[PDB]
Amino acid sequence: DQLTEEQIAEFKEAFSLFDKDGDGTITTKELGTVMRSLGQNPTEAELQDMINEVDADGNGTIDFPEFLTMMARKMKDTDSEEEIREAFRVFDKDGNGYISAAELRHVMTNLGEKLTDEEVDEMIREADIDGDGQVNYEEFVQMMTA
Amino acid sequence: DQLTEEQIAEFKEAFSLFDKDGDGTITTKELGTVMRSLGQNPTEAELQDMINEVDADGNGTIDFPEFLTMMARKMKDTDSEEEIREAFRVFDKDGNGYISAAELRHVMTNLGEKLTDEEVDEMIREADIDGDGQVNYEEFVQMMTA
Amino acid sequence: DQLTEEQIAEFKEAFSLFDKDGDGTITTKELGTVMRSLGQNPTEAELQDMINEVDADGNGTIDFPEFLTMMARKMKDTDSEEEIREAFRVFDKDGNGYISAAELRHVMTNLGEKLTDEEVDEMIREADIDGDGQVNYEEFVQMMTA
Amino acid sequence: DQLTEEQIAEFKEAFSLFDKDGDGTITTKELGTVMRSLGQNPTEAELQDMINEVDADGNGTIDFPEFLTMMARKMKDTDSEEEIREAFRVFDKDGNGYISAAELRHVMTNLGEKLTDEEVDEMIREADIDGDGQVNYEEFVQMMTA
Amino acid sequence: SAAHKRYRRLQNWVYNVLERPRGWAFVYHVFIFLLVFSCLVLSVLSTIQEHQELANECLLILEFVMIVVFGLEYIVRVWSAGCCCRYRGWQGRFRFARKPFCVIDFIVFVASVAVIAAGTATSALRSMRFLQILRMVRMDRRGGTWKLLGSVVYAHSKELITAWYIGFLVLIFASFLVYLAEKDANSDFSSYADSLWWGTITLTTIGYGDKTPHTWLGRVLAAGFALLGISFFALPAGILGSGFALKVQEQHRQKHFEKRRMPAANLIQAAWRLYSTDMSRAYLTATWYDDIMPAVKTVIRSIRILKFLVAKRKFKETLRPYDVKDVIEQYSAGHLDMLGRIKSLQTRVDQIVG
Amino acid sequence: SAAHKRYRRLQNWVYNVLERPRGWAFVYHVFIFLLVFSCLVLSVLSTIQEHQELANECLLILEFVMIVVFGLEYIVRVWSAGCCCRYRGWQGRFRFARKPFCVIDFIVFVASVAVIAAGTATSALRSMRFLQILRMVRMDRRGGTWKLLGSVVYAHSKELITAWYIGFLVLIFASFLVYLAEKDANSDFSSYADSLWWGTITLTTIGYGDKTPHTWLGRVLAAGFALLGISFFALPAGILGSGFALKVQEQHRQKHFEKRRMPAANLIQAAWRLYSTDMSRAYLTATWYDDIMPAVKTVIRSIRILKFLVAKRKFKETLRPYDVKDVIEQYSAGHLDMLGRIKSLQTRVDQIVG
Amino acid sequence: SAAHKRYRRLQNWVYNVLERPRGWAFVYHVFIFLLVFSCLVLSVLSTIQEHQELANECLLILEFVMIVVFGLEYIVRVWSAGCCCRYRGWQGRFRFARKPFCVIDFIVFVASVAVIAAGTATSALRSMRFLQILRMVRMDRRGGTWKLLGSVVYAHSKELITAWYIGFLVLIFASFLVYLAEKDANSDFSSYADSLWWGTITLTTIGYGDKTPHTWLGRVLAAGFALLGISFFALPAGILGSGFALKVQEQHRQKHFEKRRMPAANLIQAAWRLYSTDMSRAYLTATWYDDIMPAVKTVIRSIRILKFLVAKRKFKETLRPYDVKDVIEQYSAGHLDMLGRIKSLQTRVDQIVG
Amino acid sequence: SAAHKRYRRLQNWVYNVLERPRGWAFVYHVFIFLLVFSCLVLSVLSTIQEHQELANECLLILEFVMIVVFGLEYIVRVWSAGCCCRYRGWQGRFRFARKPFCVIDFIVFVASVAVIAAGTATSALRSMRFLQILRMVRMDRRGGTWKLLGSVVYAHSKELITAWYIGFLVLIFASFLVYLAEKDANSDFSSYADSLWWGTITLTTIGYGDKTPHTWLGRVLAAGFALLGISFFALPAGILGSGFALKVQEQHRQKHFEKRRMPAANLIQAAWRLYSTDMSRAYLTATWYDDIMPAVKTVIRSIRILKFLVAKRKFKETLRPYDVKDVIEQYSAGHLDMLGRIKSLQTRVDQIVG
Ligand SMILES: O=C1N(c2ccccc2)c2ccccc2C1(Cc1ccncc1)Cc1ccncc1
Ligand SMILES: [K+]
Ligand SMILES: [K+]
Ligand SMILES: [K+]
């Protein structure tokens, strides 16, 4: 999946929605302004955490090379596949790489940034559930890392 | 003490005082409303704990089968006899199955949901107190579990 | 020092200043009222602690037999001599039964219910201080327990 | 560097700016008044700590002999050389007696009573920095203790 | 029934000294153990040839006294069981004898008496003396010792296995190396198995002296491998010892907390209040005399049953241990309640003055 | 694909019992250890001369059974690997066999079969029996034992070194002193090296009996130096034992906390939300049908990627341990928030009334 | 009485170096211990036959020096007792000698002198030398060692009993099994008692070499049961060691708290204030000169007695240890006081503005 | 002075690898220790008679290589000392050689060379080989090992003394009792001293086999007293082991806190600010050019000296450990500040509205 030049131009056009002034950088102001226009309400500390994940210069900005790297990579990297698989394993006590559909539903809608019923319905539909009702989450992780 | 059909009908008539709408369920609203009409003042968390002790479906209700089971059983089960006997043993340091009348009186009127003087007077009258003033609480437990 | 009958009558006359009603008992009301008339200001919890030290019946009162016992005994008992001597030993690191005049002065005026300068001056005058400036506190304890 | 009599007279003239009344002592009032006239704002607890460092009599004052001793000594004593060198060693993990110019800059401007940029610029200029960018702080300590 | 009072009190006393005695009551238990241990030692010494006569002399008397004392104690205990209400009348007595260890004792006693009677296959009647040791194993109520040891062993399984594994490897290696060196000069190390016997008897620090290295190369190798592996063969004792000590200390730590308290006291109260619904003078009034609206009293009873069940649960839960994060939880509760109080002030100031 | 369901389920079951055994799965592993160990002991006893015949008799049968069982298990495991998706098709199978320990096993099996075949340099074919022990060393997944031992040894290095150092000094000194005393009377202590051999074999508490002091001066010196240094030569075991026990307890202390929780659950959610940006029915509407303003959806995806990366980090961090200073931190946060609340009241009172 | 000052100071100094010494004072005690121990060793060596002469030679001189030194020290200590006020005048001196260990010493000294005098039943006069060891047992003030050991043993009784029980069982079993195997080939294992002797001497790791297994079956059985039970026979040392270490650490933890403080200081103050009621210049005024209303001063004294008794109790309580739940208690007190403060604000706002 | 840069950097590097080795620097140190150990063992083996020739053969070469290497290292280190400023010029070099261990090394080297030269009282020149062990003792910088051992021993003195005391008593008693039993039958126990030798060699678990009980009474007594006292003679190892482990853990606990921090950073700042009073461009202005009112700048310097002295003290204090009662102290400070804030609100409400 070599990154092509047209794909780079489409990332550039998204990057320019944040950096409307043409300064080549995205700060918490530019990021948070676009987000709130869509009806999101991040906090300042959440905007700083987000920028810090890709800001190698440590000056509180995202530049286009950092933006392009994040967009090209998504979740395809091996670190993402391993950590997501480690998160499922927290809820796999048997150690057999399986989790019950009903147990997945409980964790997704009752912990963390809970999924809505419709979100979790789409998630269980997308996993090829076995007839017992058990989900092989390691093949679920490869579908999100492909 | 086979549960008879007339006994079931009397439980049903009590159950219907809670569930006046005929919905077949008792929630915190129905339970707490009957209780406060008698001048009791449970909290919401106390009403939830009470319903949770018999709510197998986990949906916050008591249905008639659960109500009937609780009413038929009272304290006659072996779990109740053992736990009540374990509670007395907390206050039996000798380990001989005895507790002093005066020590029972102190614990009943000074700890927990304290008994009034008249309540504790009736309780000590009902235990066949020995001439020393010592109470054999394991036969006291069988009278409450009979 | 056999307790004589005239000594008993003088204790009775003091006891009657507290128990002005002739009820034969001293409660926190009677004790605290006499104390505040002299310009003292004990708290309620301090009045309860004081009465509790001599109230064997545990009903929150001092009767004349308890009052007479306390007055006849003062500090002459062996428990008092031992505990006072143990308190000095807290400040005797050498373990030789000595404490410096200057160290006694620091502890008396800087810890606890501090002595005034004049109080502590009288206390150091009363101990037969050695020429070095060291106090043999075990003979100081016998003078207060004699 | 024998302390001369003219040097003593110059210390006396500084001492008299604090002790304008001629009482021969510097309290928190005299010390703090001169300091605030120059635009400093010490707290009372900071003025007590400062006086306590040189007040052998423990009465909360500085007299001229104590003032003269502090002024004659500055940082030239062996205790000062050792403790300053121990402070650098906190930030020398290699144990080789070196610290990076950039690491010195981070510690000086980000911890404690942070140096301004201009202060820390003068400090790094004064250390004979090596071509790598590493500072031999033990010879830096001898220049401040000379 | 005053005399009946005294009877029941005595019964309970003896049952306590036998069943679950504490303090001074243990004096009788210590005496029984000494009588059994002496019987054992006498039997063992009887095994010798030179001392057979005097051994049997003393054994006859001791075994007779033992049979009489244990028969008497069995009868007295099966009687004393009468105190507790569970075993009343011959019905309850027999129910008692159904216990496993009680039947074990009865079997042992009958067997001992049968042996002595047959005294008047003598070797088998002898060999059957080892049964006495059951009277010692029985003192362990519900195999407490085995369970404790098993728990502590399982908790540390990883370290124990590591020690045994590394030690076994060092043993194999050192045995081989020493065998290579002493193979010819010394006759002890004739084959590899001999070298292994030496290695075990050496590394364990038993040191019989059966076989020892004679050539200086062997001696240097043995010194090295000893001062290296003797510690491996001695770890299990140290690991298990520290495990036991830490467990004891930590347990003794929980007792100081005394957290369970209040729940046991409340359970008895909810049980009494439920029970008294059906017998209290509070319900023996014209008002309560049930004929027109029976459900009212039934509803009141249903509420007391629900509260009883809440109290029984809270009581069972107290046994479970609690974390040290409670302080954070009380600060969270305290802060939240106070922050809500400042809000209620703020809203009222904004309501009146605006 | 129901039958395919059953196939895959069985495959996963066997792979679990082999690769990650738990509970009853460990029973099969214990049997394999019993087989390897019996083969080893039989070989060793075969080394003896008097028992060579019966040893080889039993060894033939046992070795044949061993070869068959281990070949079968190897084939079954390399098949069962099919469950996990990583190794699918012969491509994935071969990728599996690339593992180090799998190739080690295959080598050992082929070698054993070649030995038995050559059975029909016999001494070398014998000596090659020691290879079986690899089937035991392989049970240690990733040298866990060695790593644990190394960690605990390194943490205590200072005390161990102190013990060994002082012990060595005491040994040198006591050996010299005793040699001085027994030099002439006793023939054992002919030279200094002999005295050193004695000193080691005594201070370690092995005590062969090879050499012992004969003159009373030597005996008093040995008693003194023993009751002084025997404790030094036994410290390492005690130190390491307490170290292991404390480490186990403290670890078991971390498990109660269950601090990591929430982060793992949120990571799966941020990953699902990011993934569903490109397939959800939420984006299959006329509104989203991309042609006029593609960047809007790209910007929405870029935000979900950033949140996913925040959740992955918070999830990875949970593994790291946390200090007990959190309570101070919550008080600092709680006090600061409340002090700021009283300020906001004060400013509003001063605004309205002044 | 300046010279009397110096006299009393010297007296107190010597009494301190005798009754309870610190630092350099312990040097004298070490010298006394060396003297007693040398006397003991000389006596033991005198027991031998070949060394009787030189032994008695040295023993005469050493025993004479010992008698003189200990007589002198006894006299000096019974004099130095004069420092403390309890024992003043011959009355108090005799009261002193009533102590148990003082009379024990006097008896031992008189007996030693009588023995030496009789020197000019010689075997009994010899045997009476063992009495010196009392001069060592006396150093233990109030059997501190025995009490410490007893406490720590009782606290761990369960684990100790488990270890001894399981070890005894393993010993019985392994001894029986090995006896079965070596019964015929080896002559050592003639009877069961011999096998038991072997089992003990092995499992304890003493390993005399008296009896060892000769047949390979016996050797394998012994290796197994050893590598299984040697750890059981070595637990008590590990358990007790960890117990002692943990107890020491935890105690040293209590000292850092320094909780008792304030109570001891306040007790002296309440005692002085009570005492001064009857001698202070504050009461030597015309106002207080008692004739018209004696009860007023008596009432003031009664109040000081009650406060003294409160201070004595609070002082005795400080010795008792305190829990780590105090922080929860201070938060409860702090929250309650603050919540009551916001209520008092709320009521006043509602009073004025309404 | 670029080349001078490289020179000084190399100098510092070598001085670091020699004086304070860390990481890979220890590789050189291990080689030096291995070479020293090889020399000792060769000498010892030279002591034997049968191996004297080959021993001296190898010893000649090894000793020569040793002398050359250590001379070279001495010269290189005394040169490398040049890095630190303390020892510059021959003045500073000589100041360096004044160190104790440096002169010790020079003496040892000169002595070794003199011995080899005299090679061309030969027995004394031999005996002087033991000096090498100083090159091992020197590795302990400032007797760290001795100090650690002494601290841990002193902290536990009470338990150690109890163990030794009770063990000694049990030894005396058991020896006497066994002697009474074996006195006649067995020839080993000829006198009491023999019984004591046996008792020590048994209770310590050495077990030479020299003397063992032969009569069954003696065997039973020995079994009892062994299974009673062997644990006493093994306590010191367990106590000291747990002590060391606990100390290590608790220390490793203090490092996690990282409390000292901020003070060291502030000290450098106060020192720089004081120093810069006399050289900063901030004071090189017409305004500061001192002629009219010199005291103003002197007063400013006096203030910086006082602040420097406060920072030096706070820095020295950080080294001292801190208690876990700080949380109570922060609540006390936080509550007091907040309670004072509600008072300031209350007073202002009462001022305006009244
Ligand atoms: O840290 C501890 N506490 C504790 C900490 C924060 C708040 C409350 C309590 C605690 C309480 C009772 C006994 C022992 C402890 C320890 C250690 C300690 C340290 C200094 N002085 C006394 C003790 C160990 C511990 C750690 C982790 N889990 C359990 C125990
Ligand atoms: K041993
Ligand atoms: K041994
Ligand atoms: K031996």
Q: Which properties best describe this structure?
A:
heterooctamer; A: 146 residues; mainly alpha; Recoverin, domain 1; two-stranded antiparallel sheet; two-stranded antiparallel ribbon; 4 strands; 58% helix; elongated; E: 354 residues; Helix Hairpins; 4 domains; 15 helices; 0% strand; binds 1-phenyl-3,3-bis(pyridin-4-ylmethyl)indol-2-one; binds potassium ion
Summed up:
Chains E, F, G, H: A 1,2-diacyl-sn-glycero-3-phospho-(1D-myo-inositol-4,5-bisphosphate) 1 binds at residues 20, 99, 141-142, 147. Chain A has 146 residues and is mainly α.
Explain this structure:
The complex is a heterooctamer, with four copies of chain A (146 residues) and four copies of chain E (354 residues). Chain A has 146 residues and is mainly alpha-helical. Chain A has helices spanning 5-18, 28-37, 44-52, 64-73, 78-90, 101-110, 117-126, 137-144, and strands at 25-26, 62-63, 98-100, 134-136. Chain A has a domain at 5-73: Recoverin, domain 1, CATH 1.10.238. Chain E has 354 residues and is mainly alpha-helical. Chain E has four domains: 2-139; 157-236, Helix Hairpins; 259-322; 328-354. Chain E is 73% helix and 0% strand. Chain E contains 15 helices and no strands. Chain E has helices spanning 2-18, 26-47, 52-80, 89-97, 100-118, 122-127, 134-137, 144-155, 157-182, 192-203, 216-229, 235-257, 262-276, 295-318, 326-352. The relative contact order of chain E is 0.04. The chains are: A mainly alpha (146), E mainly alpha (354). The complex binds 1-phenyl-3,3-bis(pyridin-4-ylmethyl)indol-2-one and potassium ion (3 copies). One potassium ion sits between chains E (205-207) and F (205-207). One potassium ion (K) sits between chains E (205-207) and F (205-207). It is classed as membrane protein.
